[PDB]
Amino acid sequence: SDDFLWFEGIAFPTMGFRSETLRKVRDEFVIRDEDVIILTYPKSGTNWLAEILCLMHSKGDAKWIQSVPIWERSPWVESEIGYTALSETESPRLFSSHLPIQLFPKSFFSSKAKVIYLMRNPRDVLVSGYFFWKNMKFIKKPKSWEEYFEWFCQGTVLYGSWFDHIHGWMPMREEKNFLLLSYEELKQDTGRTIEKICQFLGKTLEPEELNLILKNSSFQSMKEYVVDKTQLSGDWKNHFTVAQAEDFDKLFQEKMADLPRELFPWE
Amino acid sequence: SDDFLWFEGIAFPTMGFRSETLRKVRDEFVIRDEDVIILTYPKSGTNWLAEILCLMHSKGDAKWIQSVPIWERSPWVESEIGYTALSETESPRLFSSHLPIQLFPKSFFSSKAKVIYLMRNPRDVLVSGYFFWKNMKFIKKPKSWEEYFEWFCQGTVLYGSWFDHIHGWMPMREEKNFLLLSYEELKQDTGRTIEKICQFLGKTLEPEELNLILKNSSFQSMKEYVVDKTQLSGDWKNHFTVAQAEDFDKLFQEKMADLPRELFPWE
Ligand SMILES: C[C@]12CC[C@H](O)C[C@@H]1CC[C@@H]1[C@@H]2CC[C@]2(C)C(=O)CC[C@@H]12
Ligand SMILES: C[C@]12CC[C@H](O)C[C@@H]1CC[C@@H]1[C@@H]2CC[C@]2(C)C(=O)CC[C@@H]12
């Protein structure tokens, strides 16, 4: 048991993903200009973003969003289920992806499809991944926190290096059809962030529609195969030892050096 | 099972300590002016200090120090064994104690006995205590690191609050018969520290005697009932989470406020 789908240098969940499909996503999937895409390193806040975009679509009514699953309202192009859905779906399409740039649909780079890339403090991302993946069946889990930590810094985890994932997509931060958001600005000022998404997508909204959306898309609202049915806590500081923080800092600085430090809002 | 000897508001090991004896240590034990005493909050570096004082006595020859146990070469006045030994021992006497000031022999405060008080970064002290006490039989051990941490900050551990232990003895830092040392200066500059101990005790040494002592009393040299025979790792930063460090800082500052911050060499 290796416990993961090794594809083109990137690890993938054993289930729901086939090598062949991955090869198609890159070589054949067709991106439409009308498409709206959510790009995120896993555990960076995809659902919140996704949920916000659905609220903007329904103009506040959270009933469909409440009935339909995440994977249905915004499928993962790279997955079996999703790749299928997206293909036979009427434009305009809303989907998500955790794929690094070198494996993203080739048709995309020739299109005018709008992409919203959401990044988050990697430390939180690491914490969030640990407690998520170690609660998933049929997935190589870590012997301990110490081990997973090591994995993450090495990029050996599902979807590869965070640093890599970030470096690849950053050269697009200034394209007109590319909106770079931070999970921190999303949680700190959901309205300003919704405002940005609104201009970027070119969607206008009546005052009362914005209020409902702002209402139904708050951190309070948001808060609402499994190894332990029970879990179905804090902040990264509640998990990194002081030594891991210093080592992590040193690592973050060494790998993100070639980038404007001011891109990453977190201290 | 309570698992500890509660005496006058301070917890004690269940074995080797009797309430009655404790009452005597305070009320009856007689301190001689010729006495040399090592005062330390447990896990602050008593053995290193003790080992240094024996080396200074033997002028370098570490054979007795090698054959005789710590509890024999410098007994704990508060213990059954030690209280016995100290009583029927010829002056000058060298012993140790972890007792807070309000429980120290009353005869002491009228004597001219020389006391060396060694303190150490409480964070290390906490780490060192956890891995020590949880490897001792017949001693209430913590359910986890989180719990012990909480105990220590509350002073609920053996020998009570560190902060308390420190506050009580600090008013003596300027007495002529009282030498205040830091474990950090002992590890950083063993020679200067041995120099201080030498003047304080008024002991002179031939160059070759100092070299041997300096040799036999280095951090390298130093490094050399048990639940796990095996253990018979890092620094405090390898154990406190970032959150515990910040909470600890905040706590240290709130409790040590009434003292010159510059007394504590650690950052
Ligand atoms: C693991 C994950 C992608 C990594 C995410 O941040 C956690 C997601 C859980 C839901 C998964 C999804 C991959 C594709 C799946 C398998 C589907 O198509 C339906 C369930 C979907
Ligand atoms: C626990 C301790 C005092 C707290 C120390 O930092 C760890 C020491 C271990 C050796 C113990 C000593 C108390 C008194 C004892 C019981 C003796 O008299 C012989 C063995 C001695």
Coordinates of C-alpha atoms and ligand atoms in Angstrom, one line a residue:
Chain A
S1 CA 0.0 0.0 0.0
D2 CA 1.5 3.3 -1.2
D3 CA -1.8 5.0 -0.4
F4 CA -1.9 7.8 -3.0
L5 CA -2.2 8.5 -6.7
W6 CA 1.2 9.7 -7.8
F7 CA 0.6 11.7 -11.0
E8 CA 3.1 13.9 -12.8
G9 CA 5.0 14.5 -9.6
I10 CA 1.9 15.3 -7.5
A11 CA 0.1 13.2 -4.9
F12 CA -3.7 12.6 -5.2
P13 CA -6.5 11.0 -3.1
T14 CA -6.7 7.3 -4.0
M15 CA -10.4 7.5 -4.7
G16 CA -12.3 9.7 -7.1
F17 CA -9.2 10.4 -9.1
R18 CA -7.9 8.5 -12.1
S19 CA -4.6 9.1 -13.9
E20 CA -6.3 9.1 -17.3
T21 CA -8.8 11.8 -16.2
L22 CA -5.9 13.9 -14.9
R23 CA -4.2 13.6 -18.4
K24 CA -7.4 14.8 -20.0
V25 CA -8.0 17.8 -17.6
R26 CA -4.7 19.1 -18.9
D27 CA -4.8 18.0 -22.5
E28 CA -8.5 18.0 -23.4
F29 CA -10.8 19.7 -20.9
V30 CA -12.2 22.9 -22.6
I31 CA -12.3 26.1 -20.6
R32 CA -15.0 28.5 -21.7
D33 CA -14.5 32.3 -21.4
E34 CA -17.8 32.4 -19.4
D35 CA -16.3 30.2 -16.8
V36 CA -15.6 31.4 -13.3
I37 CA -12.9 29.4 -11.5
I38 CA -11.8 29.0 -7.8
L39 CA -8.1 28.2 -7.5
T40 CA -6.9 27.1 -4.1
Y41 CA -4.3 25.1 -2.3
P42 CA -6.4 22.6 -0.4
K43 CA -7.7 24.0 3.0
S44 CA -7.4 27.6 2.0
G45 CA -11.1 28.5 2.2
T46 CA -12.6 27.2 -1.0
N47 CA -16.0 26.6 0.4
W48 CA -16.4 30.0 1.9
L49 CA -15.4 31.5 -1.4
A50 CA -17.6 29.1 -3.3
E51 CA -20.5 29.7 -0.9
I52 CA -20.1 33.4 -1.5
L53 CA -20.2 33.1 -5.3
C54 CA -23.4 31.0 -5.0
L55 CA -25.0 33.6 -2.7
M56 CA -24.1 36.3 -5.2
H57 CA -25.8 34.2 -7.9
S58 CA -28.9 33.5 -5.9
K59 CA -28.7 37.1 -4.7
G60 CA -28.9 36.0 -1.0
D61 CA -31.3 33.1 -1.0
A62 CA -29.4 30.3 0.7
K63 CA -31.8 27.4 0.0
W64 CA -30.2 25.8 -3.0
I65 CA -26.8 26.5 -1.5
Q66 CA -28.3 24.7 1.6
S67 CA -29.7 21.7 -0.4
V68 CA -27.1 21.2 -3.0
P69 CA -23.6 19.9 -2.0
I70 CA -20.3 21.9 -2.4
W71 CA -19.1 19.4 -5.0
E72 CA -22.3 19.9 -7.0
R73 CA -22.5 23.7 -6.9
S74 CA -18.8 24.0 -7.8
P75 CA -17.3 20.7 -8.8
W76 CA -13.5 19.9 -8.9
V77 CA -12.5 19.7 -12.5
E78 CA -9.7 17.2 -11.6
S79 CA -12.1 14.7 -10.1
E80 CA -14.0 11.9 -11.8
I81 CA -17.4 13.1 -10.6
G82 CA -16.7 16.8 -11.4
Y83 CA -14.8 16.3 -14.6
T84 CA -17.9 14.5 -15.8
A85 CA -20.4 17.2 -14.5
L86 CA -18.4 20.1 -15.9
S87 CA -18.3 18.5 -19.3
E88 CA -22.0 18.2 -19.7
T89 CA -22.9 21.5 -18.0
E90 CA -24.4 24.6 -19.5
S91 CA -22.3 27.8 -19.5
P92 CA -21.6 29.8 -17.5
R93 CA -19.8 27.3 -15.2
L94 CA -18.6 27.7 -11.7
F95 CA -16.0 25.1 -10.5
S96 CA -13.0 24.7 -8.3
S97 CA -9.5 23.2 -8.5
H98 CA -6.5 22.6 -6.3
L99 CA -4.3 21.9 -9.3
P100 CA -0.9 23.6 -9.6
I101 CA -0.4 25.6 -12.8
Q102 CA 1.6 23.1 -14.7
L103 CA -1.3 20.7 -14.6
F104 CA -4.1 23.1 -15.2
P105 CA -6.2 22.8 -18.4
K106 CA -4.2 24.0 -21.4
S107 CA -7.3 25.5 -22.9
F108 CA -7.4 27.9 -20.0
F109 CA -4.3 29.9 -21.0
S110 CA -5.9 30.9 -24.2
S111 CA -9.3 31.8 -22.7
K112 CA -10.8 34.8 -21.0
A113 CA -12.2 32.8 -18.2
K114 CA -12.1 34.6 -14.8
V115 CA -10.1 33.0 -12.0
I116 CA -10.1 33.9 -8.3
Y117 CA -7.1 32.6 -6.6
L118 CA -7.4 32.4 -2.8
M119 CA -4.3 31.9 -0.6
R120 CA -4.0 31.6 3.1
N121 CA -1.4 31.6 5.8
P122 CA 0.4 28.3 5.2
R123 CA 0.7 27.6 8.9
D124 CA -3.1 27.5 9.2
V125 CA -3.3 25.5 6.0
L126 CA -0.9 23.0 7.6
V127 CA -3.0 22.8 10.8
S128 CA -6.2 22.5 8.8
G129 CA -4.9 19.8 6.6
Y130 CA -3.6 17.6 9.4
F131 CA -6.9 17.5 11.3
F132 CA -8.8 16.9 8.0
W133 CA -6.8 14.3 6.3
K134 CA -6.2 12.2 9.4
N135 CA -10.0 11.9 9.6
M136 CA -10.3 10.6 6.0
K137 CA -10.4 6.9 5.2
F138 CA -8.2 5.4 2.5
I139 CA -5.6 8.1 2.7
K140 CA -2.1 7.8 3.9
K141 CA -2.2 9.5 7.3
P142 CA 0.7 10.7 9.4
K143 CA 2.2 8.8 12.3
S144 CA 2.1 12.1 14.2
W145 CA 2.0 15.9 14.1
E146 CA 5.8 16.0 13.9
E147 CA 5.7 13.8 10.8
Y148 CA 3.0 15.6 8.9
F149 CA 4.7 18.9 9.7
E150 CA 7.8 17.6 8.0
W151 CA 5.7 16.3 5.1
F152 CA 4.1 19.7 4.5
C153 CA 7.4 21.6 4.5
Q154 CA 8.7 19.1 2.0
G155 CA 5.6 19.3 -0.2
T156 CA 5.2 15.5 0.1
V157 CA 1.5 15.9 0.9
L158 CA -1.6 15.7 -1.3
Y159 CA -1.3 18.3 -4.1
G160 CA 2.4 18.9 -3.4
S161 CA 4.3 21.8 -2.0
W162 CA 2.3 24.8 -0.9
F163 CA 5.3 27.1 -1.8
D164 CA 5.3 25.5 -5.3
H165 CA 1.6 25.9 -5.7
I166 CA 1.9 29.5 -4.8
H167 CA 5.0 30.3 -7.0
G168 CA 3.4 28.8 -10.1
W169 CA 0.2 30.9 -10.0
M170 CA 1.7 34.2 -8.7
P171 CA 2.9 35.3 -12.2
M172 CA -0.8 35.7 -13.0
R173 CA -1.6 38.1 -10.2
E174 CA -1.7 41.1 -12.6
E175 CA -3.7 39.7 -15.4
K176 CA -7.1 41.4 -15.8
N177 CA -9.0 38.0 -15.6
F178 CA -7.2 37.0 -12.4
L179 CA -8.2 38.1 -8.9
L180 CA -5.8 37.3 -6.1
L181 CA -7.4 37.2 -2.7
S182 CA -6.2 36.3 0.8
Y183 CA -8.2 34.3 3.3
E184 CA -7.2 36.9 5.8
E185 CA -8.9 39.7 4.0
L186 CA -11.9 37.5 3.4
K187 CA -12.3 36.8 7.2
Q188 CA -11.3 40.3 8.3
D189 CA -13.4 42.3 5.8
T190 CA -16.0 40.1 4.0
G191 CA -17.7 43.0 2.5
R192 CA -14.7 44.7 0.9
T193 CA -13.8 41.3 -0.4
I194 CA -17.3 40.7 -1.8
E195 CA -17.0 44.2 -3.3
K196 CA -13.7 43.2 -5.1
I197 CA -15.2 39.9 -6.3
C198 CA -18.2 41.9 -7.6
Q199 CA -16.2 44.3 -9.7
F200 CA -13.8 41.6 -10.9
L201 CA -16.8 39.5 -12.1
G202 CA -18.7 42.6 -13.1
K203 CA -21.8 41.9 -11.1
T204 CA -23.9 44.7 -9.6
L205 CA -26.2 44.3 -6.6
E206 CA -29.2 46.1 -5.1
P207 CA -28.5 47.2 -1.5
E208 CA -30.9 44.7 0.0
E209 CA -29.3 41.9 -2.0
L210 CA -25.9 42.9 -0.7
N211 CA -27.1 42.9 2.9
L212 CA -28.6 39.4 2.7
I213 CA -25.4 38.2 1.0
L214 CA -23.3 39.8 3.5
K215 CA -25.5 38.3 6.1
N216 CA -25.5 34.7 4.7
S217 CA -21.7 34.9 4.0
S218 CA -20.2 35.8 7.3
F219 CA -17.7 33.9 9.4
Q220 CA -20.5 33.2 11.9
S221 CA -22.7 31.8 9.1
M222 CA -19.9 29.8 7.5
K223 CA -19.3 28.0 10.7
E224 CA -21.9 25.3 10.7
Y225 CA -15.1 8.1 4.4
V226 CA -14.8 9.8 7.8
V227 CA -12.5 7.8 10.1
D228 CA -14.4 9.2 13.2
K229 CA -18.0 10.1 12.6
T230 CA -17.7 12.4 15.7
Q231 CA -15.5 15.1 14.3
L232 CA -17.1 14.7 10.9
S233 CA -9.7 24.1 17.5
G234 CA -7.9 27.4 18.0
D235 CA -5.2 28.8 15.7
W236 CA -1.9 27.6 14.2
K237 CA -0.2 29.0 17.3
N238 CA -2.0 26.3 19.3
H239 CA -0.1 23.7 17.4
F240 CA 3.3 24.8 16.2
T241 CA 5.9 24.5 18.9
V242 CA 8.1 27.6 19.2
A243 CA 10.8 25.7 17.4
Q244 CA 8.5 24.8 14.5
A245 CA 7.5 28.4 14.1
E246 CA 11.1 29.7 13.9
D247 CA 12.0 26.8 11.5
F248 CA 8.9 27.5 9.5
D249 CA 9.7 31.2 9.3
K250 CA 13.2 30.5 8.2
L251 CA 11.8 28.2 5.6
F252 CA 9.1 30.5 4.4
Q253 CA 11.7 33.3 3.9
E254 CA 14.1 31.0 2.0
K255 CA 11.5 29.8 -0.4
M256 CA 9.4 33.0 -0.9
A257 CA 12.4 35.3 -1.2
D258 CA 12.0 35.9 -4.9
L259 CA 8.6 37.4 -4.2
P260 CA 7.4 40.7 -2.7
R261 CA 7.0 39.8 0.9
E262 CA 4.1 42.3 0.9
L263 CA 2.0 39.8 -1.1
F264 CA 1.5 37.7 2.0
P265 CA -0.7 39.7 4.5
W266 CA 0.2 37.4 7.4
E267 CA 2.9 38.5 9.8
Chain B
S1 CA -5.1 8.2 46.3
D2 CA -4.2 11.9 46.5
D3 CA -0.7 11.0 45.6
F4 CA 1.3 13.7 47.4
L5 CA 2.3 14.9 50.9
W6 CA 0.4 18.2 51.3
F7 CA 2.4 20.2 54.0
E8 CA 1.8 23.8 55.0
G9 CA 0.4 24.6 51.6
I10 CA 3.2 22.8 49.6
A11 CA 3.1 19.5 47.8
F12 CA 5.8 16.8 48.5
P13 CA 6.9 13.5 47.2
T14 CA 4.9 10.7 48.9
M15 CA 8.0 8.8 49.8
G16 CA 11.1 9.8 51.8
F17 CA 9.2 12.7 53.4
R18 CA 7.2 12.8 56.6
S19 CA 5.1 15.7 57.8
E20 CA 6.8 15.5 61.3
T21 CA 10.3 15.8 59.8
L22 CA 9.2 18.9 57.8
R23 CA 7.9 20.5 61.0
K24 CA 11.3 19.9 62.6
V25 CA 13.4 21.2 59.6
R26 CA 11.7 24.5 60.3
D27 CA 11.4 24.5 64.0
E28 CA 14.4 22.5 65.2
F29 CA 17.1 21.8 62.6
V30 CA 20.2 23.8 63.6
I31 CA 22.1 25.6 60.9
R32 CA 25.8 26.1 61.5
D33 CA 27.7 29.2 60.3
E34 CA 30.2 26.8 58.6
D35 CA 27.3 25.4 56.5
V36 CA 27.3 25.9 52.7
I37 CA 23.8 25.5 51.2
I38 CA 22.4 25.0 47.7
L39 CA 18.9 26.5 47.3
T40 CA 17.0 25.6 44.2
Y41 CA 13.5 25.2 42.8
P42 CA 13.6 21.6 41.6
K43 CA 15.2 21.0 38.2
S44 CA 17.2 24.2 38.2
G45 CA 20.6 22.7 38.1
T46 CA 21.3 21.5 41.6
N47 CA 23.5 18.6 40.7
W48 CA 25.8 20.6 38.5
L49 CA 26.2 23.2 41.2
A50 CA 26.6 20.5 43.9
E51 CA 29.1 18.6 41.6
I52 CA 31.1 21.8 41.2
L53 CA 31.3 22.5 45.0
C54 CA 32.5 18.9 45.5
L55 CA 35.1 19.3 42.8
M56 CA 36.3 22.5 44.5
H57 CA 36.6 20.6 47.7
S58 CA 38.5 17.7 46.2
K59 CA 40.4 20.2 44.1
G60 CA 39.6 18.4 40.9
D61 CA 39.7 14.7 41.7
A62 CA 36.4 13.3 40.7
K63 CA 36.6 9.9 42.2
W64 CA 34.6 10.4 45.4
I65 CA 32.2 12.5 43.5
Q66 CA 32.1 9.5 41.1
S67 CA 31.6 6.9 43.8
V68 CA 29.4 8.7 46.3
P69 CA 25.7 9.6 45.3
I70 CA 24.4 13.1 45.0
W71 CA 22.1 12.7 48.0
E72 CA 25.1 11.6 50.0
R73 CA 27.6 14.3 49.0
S74 CA 24.9 17.0 49.5
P75 CA 21.8 15.7 51.2
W76 CA 18.3 17.3 51.1
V77 CA 17.7 18.7 54.6
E78 CA 13.9 18.2 54.1
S79 CA 14.2 14.5 53.4
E80 CA 14.2 11.7 55.9
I81 CA 17.5 10.3 54.8
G82 CA 19.2 13.7 54.6
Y83 CA 17.6 15.2 57.7
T84 CA 19.1 12.2 59.5
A85 CA 22.6 12.5 57.8
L86 CA 22.9 16.3 58.2
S87 CA 22.1 16.0 61.9
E88 CA 24.9 13.6 62.7
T89 CA 27.5 15.1 60.3
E90 CA 30.7 17.0 61.2
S91 CA 30.9 20.6 60.2
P92 CA 31.5 22.1 57.7
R93 CA 28.3 20.7 56.0
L94 CA 27.3 20.9 52.3
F95 CA 23.6 20.2 51.7
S96 CA 20.8 21.2 49.3
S97 CA 17.1 22.2 49.6
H98 CA 14.2 23.0 47.4
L99 CA 12.2 24.6 50.3
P100 CA 10.6 27.9 49.8
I101 CA 11.7 30.5 52.4
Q102 CA 8.7 30.3 54.7
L103 CA 9.5 26.7 55.5
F104 CA 13.3 26.9 55.7
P105 CA 15.1 26.2 59.1
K106 CA 14.4 29.1 61.4
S107 CA 17.9 28.8 62.8
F108 CA 19.2 29.8 59.4
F109 CA 18.1 33.5 59.6
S110 CA 20.2 34.0 62.6
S111 CA 23.3 32.4 61.2
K112 CA 26.2 33.3 59.0
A113 CA 25.8 30.2 56.8
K114 CA 26.6 30.8 53.2
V115 CA 23.8 30.2 50.7
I116 CA 24.0 29.9 46.9
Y117 CA 20.6 30.3 45.2
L118 CA 20.5 29.0 41.7
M119 CA 17.5 30.0 39.4
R120 CA 16.8 29.0 35.8
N121 CA 14.5 30.0 33.0
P122 CA 11.1 28.7 34.3
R123 CA 10.2 27.4 30.9
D124 CA 13.1 25.0 30.9
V125 CA 12.3 24.2 34.5
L126 CA 8.8 23.2 33.5
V127 CA 10.0 21.0 30.6
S128 CA 12.6 19.4 32.7
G129 CA 10.1 18.7 35.5
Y130 CA 7.5 17.1 33.2
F131 CA 9.9 14.5 31.7
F132 CA 11.4 13.8 35.1
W133 CA 8.3 13.4 37.3
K134 CA 6.4 11.5 34.7
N135 CA 9.2 8.9 35.0
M136 CA 8.9 8.5 38.7
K137 CA 6.8 5.8 40.5
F138 CA 4.4 6.7 43.3
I139 CA 4.0 10.3 42.1
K140 CA 0.8 11.9 40.8
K141 CA 1.7 12.3 37.1
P142 CA 0.0 14.5 34.6
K143 CA -2.6 13.2 32.1
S144 CA -0.7 15.1 29.4
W145 CA 1.7 18.0 28.6
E146 CA -1.2 20.4 28.4
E147 CA -2.3 19.5 32.0
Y148 CA 1.2 19.7 33.6
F149 CA 1.7 23.0 31.9
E150 CA -1.4 24.3 33.6
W151 CA -0.3 22.8 36.9
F152 CA 3.1 24.6 36.8
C153 CA 1.6 28.0 36.0
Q154 CA -0.7 27.5 38.9
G155 CA 2.1 26.3 41.3
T156 CA 0.1 23.1 42.0
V157 CA 3.2 20.9 41.4
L158 CA 5.7 19.5 43.8
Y159 CA 7.2 22.3 45.9
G160 CA 4.6 24.8 44.8
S161 CA 4.7 27.9 42.5
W162 CA 8.0 28.7 40.9
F163 CA 7.1 32.4 41.0
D164 CA 6.4 32.0 44.7
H165 CA 9.7 30.2 45.3
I166 CA 11.5 33.0 43.5
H167 CA 9.7 35.9 45.2
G168 CA 10.4 34.6 48.7
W169 CA 14.1 34.2 48.3
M170 CA 14.8 37.3 46.2
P171 CA 14.8 39.8 49.2
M172 CA 18.1 38.1 50.2
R173 CA 19.9 38.7 46.9
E174 CA 22.0 41.5 48.5
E175 CA 23.0 39.9 51.8
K176 CA 26.8 39.2 52.1
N177 CA 26.2 35.5 52.8
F178 CA 23.9 35.1 49.8
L179 CA 25.1 34.4 46.3
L180 CA 22.5 34.6 43.5
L181 CA 23.4 32.6 40.4
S182 CA 21.6 31.8 37.1
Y183 CA 21.8 28.5 35.4
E184 CA 22.3 30.4 32.2
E185 CA 25.5 32.0 33.5
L186 CA 26.6 28.6 34.8
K187 CA 26.2 27.0 31.4
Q188 CA 27.4 30.0 29.4
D189 CA 30.5 30.8 31.5
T190 CA 31.3 28.0 33.9
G191 CA 34.7 29.6 34.8
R192 CA 33.4 33.1 35.7
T193 CA 30.7 31.4 37.7
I194 CA 33.2 29.2 39.5
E195 CA 35.2 32.3 40.1
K196 CA 32.2 34.0 41.8
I197 CA 31.5 30.9 43.9
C198 CA 35.2 30.9 44.9
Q199 CA 35.2 34.5 46.2
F200 CA 31.8 34.1 47.8
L201 CA 33.1 31.0 49.7
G202 CA 36.5 32.5 50.1
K203 CA 38.3 29.6 48.6
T204 CA 41.6 30.1 46.7
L205 CA 42.9 27.7 44.0
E206 CA 46.2 26.8 42.4
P207 CA 46.1 27.2 38.5
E208 CA 46.3 23.5 37.9
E209 CA 43.5 22.9 40.4
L210 CA 41.3 25.3 38.6
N211 CA 42.0 23.7 35.2
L212 CA 41.1 20.3 36.5
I213 CA 37.9 21.6 38.2
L214 CA 37.0 23.6 35.1
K215 CA 37.6 20.4 33.2
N216 CA 35.6 18.1 35.4
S217 CA 32.8 20.6 35.7
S218 CA 31.9 21.4 32.1
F219 CA 28.5 21.0 30.4
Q220 CA 30.1 18.2 28.4
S221 CA 31.3 16.4 31.6
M222 CA 28.0 17.0 33.4
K223 CA 26.1 15.2 30.7
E224 CA 26.6 11.6 31.6
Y225 CA 11.4 4.2 41.3
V226 CA 11.8 4.8 37.6
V227 CA 8.7 4.1 35.6
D228 CA 10.7 3.3 32.5
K229 CA 14.2 1.9 33.1
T230 CA 15.1 3.1 29.6
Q231 CA 15.0 6.8 30.0
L232 CA 16.4 6.4 33.6
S233 CA 15.6 16.4 24.3
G234 CA 16.1 19.8 22.8
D235 CA 15.1 23.1 24.6
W236 CA 11.8 24.5 26.0
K237 CA 11.0 25.8 22.5
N238 CA 10.7 22.3 21.3
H239 CA 7.8 21.8 23.7
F240 CA 5.8 25.0 24.3
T241 CA 3.4 25.8 21.6
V242 CA 3.5 29.3 20.3
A243 CA 0.3 30.0 22.3
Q244 CA 1.8 28.7 25.5
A245 CA 4.9 30.9 25.1
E246 CA 2.8 34.0 24.7
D247 CA 0.5 33.0 27.6
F248 CA 3.6 32.2 29.6
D249 CA 5.2 35.5 28.8
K250 CA 2.1 37.4 29.8
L251 CA 2.0 35.4 33.0
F252 CA 5.7 35.8 33.9
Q253 CA 5.3 39.6 33.4
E254 CA 2.2 39.8 35.6
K255 CA 3.8 37.9 38.5
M256 CA 7.3 39.1 38.3
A257 CA 6.3 42.8 37.8
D258 CA 7.4 43.9 41.3
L259 CA 10.9 42.8 40.5
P260 CA 13.7 44.2 38.4
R261 CA 13.2 42.4 35.1
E262 CA 17.0 42.5 34.7
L263 CA 17.4 39.9 37.5
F264 CA 16.3 37.2 35.0
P265 CA 19.0 36.9 32.3
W266 CA 16.7 34.9 29.9
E267 CA 14.9 36.8 27.2
Ligands
LIG1 C1 -10.7 16.0 -1.0 C2 -11.4 17.3 -1.8 C3 -10.3 18.2 -2.4 C4 -9.3 18.7 -1.3 C5 -10.3 19.6 -0.5 O1 -9.9 20.9 0.2 C6 -11.1 18.6 0.6 C7 -12.2 18.1 -0.5 C8 -13.3 17.0 0.1 C9 -14.4 16.7 -1.0 C10 -13.7 15.9 -2.2 C11 -12.5 16.8 -2.8 C12 -11.9 16.1 -4.1 C13 -12.9 15.6 -5.2 C14 -14.2 14.9 -4.6 C15 -13.7 13.3 -4.3 C16 -15.5 14.8 -5.4 O2 -15.7 14.8 -6.5 C17 -16.7 14.7 -4.3 C18 -16.0 14.8 -3.0 C19 -14.7 15.6 -3.4
LIG2 C1 13.1 14.1 44.2 C2 14.5 14.9 44.7 C3 14.2 16.4 45.1 C4 13.6 17.1 43.8 C5 14.9 17.0 42.8 O1 15.3 18.0 41.8 C6 14.8 15.5 42.1 C7 15.5 14.7 43.4 C8 15.6 13.1 43.2 C9 16.5 12.5 44.4 C10 15.5 12.6 45.7 C11 15.2 14.1 46.0 C12 14.3 14.3 47.3 C13 14.9 13.5 48.6 C14 15.5 12.1 48.2 C15 14.2 11.1 48.3 C16 16.5 11.4 49.1 O2 16.8 11.6 50.3 C17 17.3 10.4 48.3 C18 16.7 10.5 46.9 C19 16.3 12.0 46.9

